[PDB]
Design an enzyme around this catalytic site. Structure first.
Site, PDB file in Angstrom:
ATOM      1  N   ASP A   1       0.470  -1.237  -0.057  1.00  0.00           N
ATOM      2  CA  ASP A   1      -0.159   0.070   0.115  1.00  0.00           C
ATOM      3  C   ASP A   1       0.770   0.723   0.131  1.00  0.00           C
ATOM      4  O   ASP A   1       1.486   1.563   1.185  1.00  0.00           O
ATOM      5  CB  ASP A   1      -1.285  -0.139   1.056  1.00  0.00           C
ATOM      6  CG  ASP A   1      -2.298  -0.855   1.381  1.00  0.00           C
ATOM      7  OD1 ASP A   1      -2.298  -1.720  -0.066  1.00  0.00           O
ATOM      8  OD2 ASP A   1      -3.247  -0.857   2.181  1.00  0.00           O
TER       9      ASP A   1
ATOM     10  N   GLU B   1     -10.402  -8.227   2.027  1.00  0.00           N
ATOM     11  CA  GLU B   1     -11.018  -9.300   2.087  1.00  0.00           C
ATOM     12  C   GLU B   1     -11.544  -9.896   3.259  1.00  0.00           C
ATOM     13  O   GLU B   1     -12.246  -9.795   4.046  1.00  0.00           O
ATOM     14  CB  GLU B   1      -9.408  -9.795   2.103  1.00  0.00           C
ATOM     15  CG  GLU B   1      -8.152 -10.252   1.119  1.00  0.00           C
ATOM     16  CD  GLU B   1      -7.091 -10.013   1.228  1.00  0.00           C
ATOM     17  OE1 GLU B   1      -6.538  -9.429   2.455  1.00  0.00           O
ATOM     18  OE2 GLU B   1      -6.256 -10.731   0.127  1.00  0.00           O
TER      19      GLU B   1
ATOM     20  N   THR C   1      -6.998 -14.468  -2.789  1.00  0.00           N
ATOM     21  CA  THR C   1      -6.075 -13.802  -2.679  1.00  0.00           C
ATOM     22  C   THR C   1      -4.572 -14.643  -3.024  1.00  0.00           C
ATOM     23  O   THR C   1      -3.282 -13.239  -3.252  1.00  0.00           O
ATOM     24  CB  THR C   1      -6.408 -12.591  -2.070  1.00  0.00           C
ATOM     25  OG1 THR C   1      -5.867 -12.798  -1.268  1.00  0.00           O
ATOM     26  CG2 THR C   1      -7.272 -12.542  -2.713  1.00  0.00           C
TER      27      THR C   1
ATOM     28  N   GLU D   1      -5.512 -14.527  -6.691  1.00  0.00           N
ATOM     29  CA  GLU D   1      -4.763 -13.287  -7.397  1.00  0.00           C
ATOM     30  C   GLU D   1      -3.842 -13.908  -6.801  1.00  0.00           C
ATOM     31  O   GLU D   1      -3.338 -14.426  -6.387  1.00  0.00           O
ATOM     32  CB  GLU D   1      -4.876 -12.272  -7.323  1.00  0.00           C
ATOM     33  CG  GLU D   1      -6.261 -11.769  -6.820  1.00  0.00           C
ATOM     34  CD  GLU D   1      -6.434 -10.675  -6.577  1.00  0.00           C
ATOM     35  OE1 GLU D   1      -6.151 -10.027  -5.571  1.00  0.00           O
ATOM     36  OE2 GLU D   1      -8.110  -9.893  -6.308  1.00  0.00           O
TER      37      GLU D   1
ATOM     38  N   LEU E   1       2.292 -11.972  -4.176  1.00  0.00           N
ATOM     39  CA  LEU E   1       3.671 -10.300  -4.303  1.00  0.00           C
ATOM     40  C   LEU E   1       3.609 -10.096  -5.602  1.00  0.00           C
ATOM     41  O   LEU E   1       3.532 -10.900  -6.771  1.00  0.00           O
ATOM     42  CB  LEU E   1       4.553 -10.938  -2.795  1.00  0.00           C
ATOM     43  CG  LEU E   1       4.077 -11.191  -1.715  1.00  0.00           C
ATOM     44  CD1 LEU E   1       5.377 -11.812  -1.164  1.00  0.00           C
ATOM     45  CD2 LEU E   1       3.631  -9.580  -1.723  1.00  0.00           C
TER      46      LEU E   1
END
Ligand SMILES: OC[C@H]1O[C@H](O[C@H]2[C@H](O)C[C@@H](O)O[C@@H]2CO)[C@H](O)[C@@H](O)[C@@H]1O
Ligand SMILES: OC[C@H]1O[C@H](O[C@H]2[C@H](O)C[C@H](O)O[C@@H]2CO)[C@H](O)[C@@H](O)[C@@H]1O
EC number: 3.2.1.2
Length: 490
Positions: free
Chosen positions: A97, A182, A338, A376, A379
């Site tokens: 982020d 999430e 994820t 997904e 990292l």
């Protein structure tokens, strides 16, 4: 049957902050040259946060959709589809982020005076990145409950974006249900000093959760039971705690009871909000999806500590994901997992990390309940190694030359489109990753050709009672995976 049936689409997350805090679509020209590169590569669509904290900034029901309309328009011009997240969480305290986007100020303001609207740890630290489940149904936000705020927001999004929806730009609505969007407790907050192989902490200490828990134990017959006080701190290892050591509290009547209570709050939180989502997009040609975090650390010990504190009551003898999938089934939603790229050997040995096994467990559980599964990378990766792992997860049993594969994921959303990705060698590898996802076929603009037609959302099926959700805790053997994909990038 033909090959195209093996095709698995690929989406690319857009940069964080593409529409900034000020509700301004910052650099269309720039994005545009980027998107045009993705279209050329064969990429199917892109994914973007629709930040609650930017949109409903000014005050309740003061939405400003304008800058997102521009973005959506530019996406549409570039020939790409779009995955939109209803991001009701804060951007900033989680891995990667780079921009800070908080939840609405007017909500923050209330929290200055009702601190218990946030997730709270045993020490009393308030995490402001997402509102506690404890308040899903408390009518304290100027007359609305939090679930009403989310529901209003999605309705608004649906009415104001109806042209894009009806034009087939938006393919799936990912409903944000917790931190990083999430469905989970913020048990591993970087902002509080949590570090990787760290167990994390339970997050049920706000006043509402606590009172709920007290009343539930009293009805169970043990009014005296209390919230865990022997779980340790963010960075412990399990053996070092009373709760998670062998024969510790987690295997007692009370630990079990707490654990079930704590993981049930999530299931319930997810089910009620998906209910609202379903009602908001009813009739639209879109799928709904939720995001489940891949918490692979401690997976390989009996206590699964990190999973437990995040709200996933998963053990070797209790499947704690399959129930989430069965819950998704009534809503006809997709489970977006994820974390897909990591190999067990890439982990420090001291993490007792079982990323590959965690994946098989979760996707199998999905397929077994007959829901769609997506995922997904966790990292940033640019190497064939990452890519070939995601490809294997996509089609665990390889390609079927004469029909659709017996097992396949519904899509994969790659982690972020940055300059790095677009650098020459990196990009060249990417393009191959795209090609192998597509099973060696060229990009295919009409998804009906690959058995992904989108239909108008139906109403959810009826509420499945908790008992029934909880039957799906019975462990099952995973489906068999190949050891290596048959469609390597390398
Ligand atoms: O909730 C965000 C992500 O958390 C986890 O990602 C971790 C990596 O697996 C390992 C290390 O770098 O810490 C990351 C969390 O800070 C999870 O694996 C992902 O699925 C989540 O998106
Ligand atoms: O922009 C999407 C999502 O990205 C980040 O969270 C990601 C994470 O970094 C990677 C993992 O694969 O999934 C998480 C959710 O997609 C941001 O932290 C998050 O706020 C953002 O909504």
């Amino acid at each position: 049957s033909n090959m195209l049936l093996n095709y698995v689409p690929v989406y690319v997350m857009l940069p964080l902050g593409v529409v900034n805090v000020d509700n301004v679509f910052e650099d269309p020209d720039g994005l545009k040259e980027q998107l045009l590169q993705l279209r050329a590569a064969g990429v199917d669509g892109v994914m973007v946060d629709v930040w609650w904290g930017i949109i409903e900034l000014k005050g309740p029901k003061q939405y400003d959709w304008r800058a997102y309309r521009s973005l959506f328009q530019l996406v549409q011009e570039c020939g790409l589809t779009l995955q939109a997240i209803m991001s009701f969480h804060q951007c900033g305290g989680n891995v990667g982020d780079i921009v800070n986007i908080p939840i609405p100020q007017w909500v923050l303001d209330i929290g200055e005076s009702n601190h218990d609207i946030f997730y709270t740890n045993r020490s009393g630290t308030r995490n402001k990145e997402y509102l506690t489940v404890g308040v899903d149904n408390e009518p304290i936000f100027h007359g609305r409950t939090a679930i009403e705020i989310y529901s209003d927001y999605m309705k608004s999004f649906r009415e104001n974006m109806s042209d894009f929806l009806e034009s087939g730009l938006i393919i799936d609505i990912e409903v944000g249900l917790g931190p990083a969007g999430e469905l989970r407790y913020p048990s591993y907050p970087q902002s509080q000093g949590w570090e990787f192989p760290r167990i994390g902490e339970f997050q049920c200490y706000d006043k509402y959760l606590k009172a709920d828990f007290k009343a539930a134990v009293a009805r169970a017959g043990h009014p005296e039971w209390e919230l865990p006080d022997d779980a340790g701190k963010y960075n412990d290892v399990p053996e070092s705690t009373g709760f998670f050591k062998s024969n510790g509290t987690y295997v007692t009547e009370k630990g079990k009871f707490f654990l079930t209570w704590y993981s049930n709050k999530l299931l319930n939180h997810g089910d009620q909000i998906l209910d609202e989502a379903n009602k908001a997009f009813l009739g639209c040609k879109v799928k709904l999806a939720i995001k489940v975090s891949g918490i692979h650390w401690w997976y390989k010990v009996e206590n699964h500590a990190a999973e437990l504190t995040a709200g996933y009551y998963n053990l070797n003898d209790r499947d704690g994901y399959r129930p989430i999938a069965r819950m998704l089934s009534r809503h006809h939603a997709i489970l977006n997992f994820t974390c897909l790229e990591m190999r067990d050997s890439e982990q420090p040995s001291d993490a007792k990390s079982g990323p590959q096994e965690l994946v098989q467990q979760v996707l199998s559980g999905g397929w077994r309940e007959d829901i769609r599964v997506a995922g997904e990378n966790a990292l940033p990766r640019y190497d064939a190694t990452a890519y070939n792992q995601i490809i294997l997860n996509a089609k665990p049993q390889g390609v079927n030359n004469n029909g659709p594969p017996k097992l396949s994921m519904f899509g994969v959303t790659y982690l972020r489109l940055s300059d790095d990705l677009l650098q020459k060698s990196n990009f060249n590898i990417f393009k191959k990753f795209v090609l192998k996802m597509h099973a060696d076929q060229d990009y295919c603009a009409n998804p009906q050709k690959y058995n992904h037609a989108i239909t108008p959302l139906k109403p959810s099926a009826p509420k499945i009672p908790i008992e029934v959700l909880l039957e799906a805790t019975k462990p099952t053997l995973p489906f068999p995976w190949l050891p290596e994909t048959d469609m390597k990038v390398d």
